[PDB]
Amino acid sequence: IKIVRAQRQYMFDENGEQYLDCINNVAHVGHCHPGVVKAALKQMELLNTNSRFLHDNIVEYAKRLSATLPEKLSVCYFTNSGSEANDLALRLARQFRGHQDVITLDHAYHGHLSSLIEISPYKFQVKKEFVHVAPTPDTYRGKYREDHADSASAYADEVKKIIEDAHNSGRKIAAFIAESMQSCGGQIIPPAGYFQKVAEYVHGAGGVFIADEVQVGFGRVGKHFWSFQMYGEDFVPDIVTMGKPMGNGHPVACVVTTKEIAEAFSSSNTYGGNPVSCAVGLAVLDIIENEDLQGNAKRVGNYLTELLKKQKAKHTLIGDIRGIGLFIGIDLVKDHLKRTPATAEAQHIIYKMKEKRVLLSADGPHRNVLKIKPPMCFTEEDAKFMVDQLDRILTVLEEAMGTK
Amino acid sequence: IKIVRAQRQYMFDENGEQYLDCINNVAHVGHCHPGVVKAALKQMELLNTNSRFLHDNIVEYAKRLSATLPEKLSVCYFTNSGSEANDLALRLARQFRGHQDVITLDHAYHGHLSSLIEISPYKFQKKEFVHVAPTPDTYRGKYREDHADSASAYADEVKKIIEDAHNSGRKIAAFIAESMQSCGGQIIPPAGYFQKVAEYVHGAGGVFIADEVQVGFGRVGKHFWSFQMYGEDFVPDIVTMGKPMGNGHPVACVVTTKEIAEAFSSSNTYGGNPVSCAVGLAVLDIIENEDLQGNAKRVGNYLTELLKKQKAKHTLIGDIRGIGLFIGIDLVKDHLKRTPATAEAQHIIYKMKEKRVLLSADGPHRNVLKIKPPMCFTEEDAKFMVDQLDRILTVLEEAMGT
Numbered sequence: 001i002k003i004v005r006a007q008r009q010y011m012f013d014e015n016g017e018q019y020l021d022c023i024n025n026v027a028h029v030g031h032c033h034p035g036v037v038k039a040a041l042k043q044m045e046l047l048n049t050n051s052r053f054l055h056d057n058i059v060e061y062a063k064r065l066s067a068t069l070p071e072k073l074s075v076c077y078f079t080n081s082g083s084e085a086n087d088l089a090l091r092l093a094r095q096f097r098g099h100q101d102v103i104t105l106d107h108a109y110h111g112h113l114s115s116l117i118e119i120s121p122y123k124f125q126v127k128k129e130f131v132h133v134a135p136t137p138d139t140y141r142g143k144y145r146e147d148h149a150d151s152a153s154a155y156a157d158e159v160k161k162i163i164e165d166a167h168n169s170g171r172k173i174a175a176f177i178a179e180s181m182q183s184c185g186g187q188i189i190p191p192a193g194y195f196q197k198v199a200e201y202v203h204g205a206g207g208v209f210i211a212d213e214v215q216v217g218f219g220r221v222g223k224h225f226w227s228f229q230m231y232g233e234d235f236v237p238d239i240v241t242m243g244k245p246m247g248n249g250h251p252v253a254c255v256v257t258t259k260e261i262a263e264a265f266s267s268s269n270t271y272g273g274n275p276v277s278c279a280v281g282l283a284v285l286d287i288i289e290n291e292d293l294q295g296n297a298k299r300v301g302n303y304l305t306e307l308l309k310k311q312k313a314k315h316t317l318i319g320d321i322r323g324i325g326l327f328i329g330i331d332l333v334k335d336h337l338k339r340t341p342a343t344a345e346a347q348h349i350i351y352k353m354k355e356k357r358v359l360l361s362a363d364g365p366h367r368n369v370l371k372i373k374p375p376m377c378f379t380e381e382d383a384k385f386m387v388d389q390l391d392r393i394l395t396v397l398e399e400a401m402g403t404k
Numbered sequence: 405i406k407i408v409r410a411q412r413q414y415m416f417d418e419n420g421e422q423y424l425d426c427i428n429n430v431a432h433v434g435h436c437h438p439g440v441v442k443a444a445l446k447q448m449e450l451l452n453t454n455s456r457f458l459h460d461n462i463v464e465y466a467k468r469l470s471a472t473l474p475e476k477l478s479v480c481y482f483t484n485s486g487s488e489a490n491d492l493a494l495r496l497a498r499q500f501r502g503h504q505d506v507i508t509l510d511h512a513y514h515g516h517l518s519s520l521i522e523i524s525p526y527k528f529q530k531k532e533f534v535h536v537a538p539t540p541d542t543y544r545g546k547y548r549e550d551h552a553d554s555a556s557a558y559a560d561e562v563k564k565i566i567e568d569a570h571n572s573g574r575k576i577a578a579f580i581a582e583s584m585q586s587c588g589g590q591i592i593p594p595a596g597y598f599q600k601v602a603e604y605v606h607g608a609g610g611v612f613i614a615d616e617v618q619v620g621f622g623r624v625g626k627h628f629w630s631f632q633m634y635g636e637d638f639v640p641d642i643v644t645m646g647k648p649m650g651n652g653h654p655v656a657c658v659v660t661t662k663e664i665a666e667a668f669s670s671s672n673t674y675g676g677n678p679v680s681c682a683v684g685l686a687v688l689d690i691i692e693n694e695d696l697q698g699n700a701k702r703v704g705n706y707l708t709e710l711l712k713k714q715k716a717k718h719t720l721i722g723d724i725r726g727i728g729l730f731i732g733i734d735l736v737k738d739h740l741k742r743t744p745a746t747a748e749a750q751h752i753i754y755k756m757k758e759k760r761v762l763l764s765a766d767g768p769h770r771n772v773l774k775i776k777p778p779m780c781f782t783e784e785d786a787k788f789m790v791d792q793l794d795r796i797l798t799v800l801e802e803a804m805g806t
């Protein structure tokens with residue numbers, strides 16, 4: 001299985017055999033997009049050296065990013081990775097008032113650096129006194145499920161209790177950080193109202209809200225540019241992080257914050273940005289705009305959701321279809337009474353889908369949630385093909401399991 | 405103000421005025437090198453997706469890097485920055501035996517991430533698990549050129565840190581040093597210092613991290629790696645490298661031993677990127693094809709001789725130090741105390757910039773003129789830079805002496 005070439009939503013092995021890419025969201029506008037390559041080439045022939053001479057590309061990119069965000073999110077710091085962006089977000093939050101503690105979600109994954117291992121319970125084998133883990137707002141397998149009267153308040157009340165317990169111990173809260181939807185956690189979309197209530201409680205403790213959009217930003221949710229905007233025009237994080245999807249896979253990432261948080265940081269340029277990275281970033285924003293990729297994600301996402309609802313109706317292995325736009329999870333279960341993760345069945349389905357040249361993966365803490373997050377040029381034809389291959393595989397698998 | 409174009413060792417403003425770049429060592433083989441651009445373009449039109457399909461570029465690059473290093477340094481982890489490489493080096497060290505403490509040098513700078521602030525005393529306006537050893541600076545440090553054996557006296561400081569830590573029931577993961585300090589003001593430790601430190605750290609179960617992020621890839625002229633200036637028998641356990649390896653593209657690497665890698669794998673983020681490895685291979689090919697290591701040796705030796713004559717003529721020059729195209733000019737108000745000439749250095753940078761030479765001043769007192777250009781820097785560039793410096797120092801010392 002040796003991939004050597006990729007174009008748009010497809011990958012090719014050394015025999016030129018075509019594979020449907022449902023995995024590499026980082027190739028956000030499509031693999032080897034000529035418009036991105038051209039932007040990179042033009043800037044690489046001129047200048048690849050950082051803004052001690054505040055370069056037109058960097059100024060224009062930061063203005064264009066800021067234009068996609070709420071009013072108060074106006075100051076851009078450029079980094080080389082989603083992980084660097086998250087590390088900077090924790091420093092901006094901790095420097096803001098000198099509070100040290102960070103509240104994170106169960107099964108969160110924020111990146112692979114030292115500072116991020118500490119706040120990424122997905123990767124806990126050693127848990128620090130300055131990190132608190134709130135129950136993940138998962139209404140399928142979490143502490144409060146779809147039958148609860150008000151899971152958004154019940155989950156948000158868990159954060160308020162962490163805050164009260166920390167205050168009672170004389171500790172202070174720098175930040176609450178959440179993936180706007182959890183990737184590794186298994187495609188978790190928090191309930192309506194949850195983030196807004198959490199932000200209110202964190203603001204009461206002098207903390208800030210960090211929204212990690214590293215996986216879910218740039219129009220993937222179809223209905224908005226930013227996954228956090230799902231929660232209404234009145235939900236505004238204090239810090240937003242973004243990763244390599246913004247560069248179509250080039251090492252570029254960004255943190256956007258408020259004047260107030262930036263000024264505290266200034267009181268004690270590495271984050272000025274790179275001309276080539278900003279040329280690539282601008283070409284990505286232009287392509288999302290010119291090719292209606294946010295609209296594509298909305299339409300193809302709605303089509304995928306409808307196909308998968310019909311798959312759920314005839315396949316008992318399907319416990320839950322969740323997601324929005326081109327961010328979808330298919331939660332596979334051994335039984336509906338207990339929602340027991342179908343880990344071994346998920347691994348088998350990925351192997352069988354790969355034999356039919358569909359590339360996907362399984363996440364969630366039990367590795368049972370099939371993940372769909374393709375390059376944004378994924379078509380209804382690609383969606384139908386993928387689901388046709390899945391239907392066949394599920395039918396054969398459930399007939400085998402159901403055999404005396 | 406205002407650079408829009410750069411080629412080789414030169415930068416150009418929007419009027420096409422030419423500037424001599426003595427600053428951007430990250431453009432290691434020269435700004436916008438066509439052979440690096442060509443290699444990036446070819447790979448970017450094919451595949452930019454990480455080795456879940458262990459890519460020929462990544463395998464070939466890691467083999468080529470490993471070939472430039474001592475035998476035991478054979479396992480490559482790829483990252484996006486020098487900072488990411490240093491963060492990974494600390495995790496490799498701490499995971500190796502579960503020791504937590506890191507010994508760093510005074511005035512060290514290892515990067516801008518959380519984990520690196522803690523071990524970068526250049527940026528302290530310290531954690532219990534960080535110990536700061538006196539920097540082995542024979543011009544302004546604790547032990548100077550008149551000491552009988554400064555390499556032993558500096559190494560003995562690390563032994564004492566190790567003993568005090570052990571006595572408190574603490575354990576040492578690592579000793580980390582820039583092979584030559586950049587921010588610290590172009591500091592070349594004495595012969596024997598690193599080898600003695602490595603023996604002491606090895607006795608504590610610790611590992612030696614050599615940070616080559618600024619000083620690697622043939623810059624020292626006499627060797628490929630700055631650490632090899634301490635002899636074929638000095639071998640770090642972990643070596644970090646940064647964006648110079650990609651001519652300024654975000655690529656960086658950690659190389660360690662099988663033993664350290666196996667302890668780490670007991671718990672492909674670091675598999676590398678096809679485009680990054682294509683750029684990396686083009687950089688290695690250019691250093692080889694253009695004899696850039698040889699250029700750094702020859703032009704470096706010429707620069708040193710020019711600057712030795714400037715020192716004889718100019719009392720503001722306290723110390724000329726460096727090797728190849730890593731040079732510091734330590735400016736002093738007086739020789740009795742070696743008082744840093746901070747205000748004079750700022751003035752000299754401003755005047756050199758008016759003559760279209762770009763340099764900077766580091767050291768903890770910002771008095772050390774730094775020369776670390778792209779590696780294609782010529783003897784003609786060296787003569788020009790020094791000619792402009794001579795004139796500026798003559799005018800400045802005549803003014804001060806009225």
Ligand SMILES: Cc1ncc(COP(=O)(O)O)c(CN)c1O
Binds near residue numbers: 082
């Ligand atoms: C939420 C989140 N944050 C950060 C990262 C880090 O990615 P990168 O290599 O660009 O640091 C990832 C994916 N690795 C992620 O899913």
Ligand SMILES: Cc1ncc(COP(=O)(O)O)c(CN)c1O
Binds near residue numbers: 515586646647
């Ligand atoms: C010794 C050293 N290490 C690491 C870095 C980090 O550079 P970056 O992480 O952006 O590539 C620097 C640059 N100041 C450095 O001088």
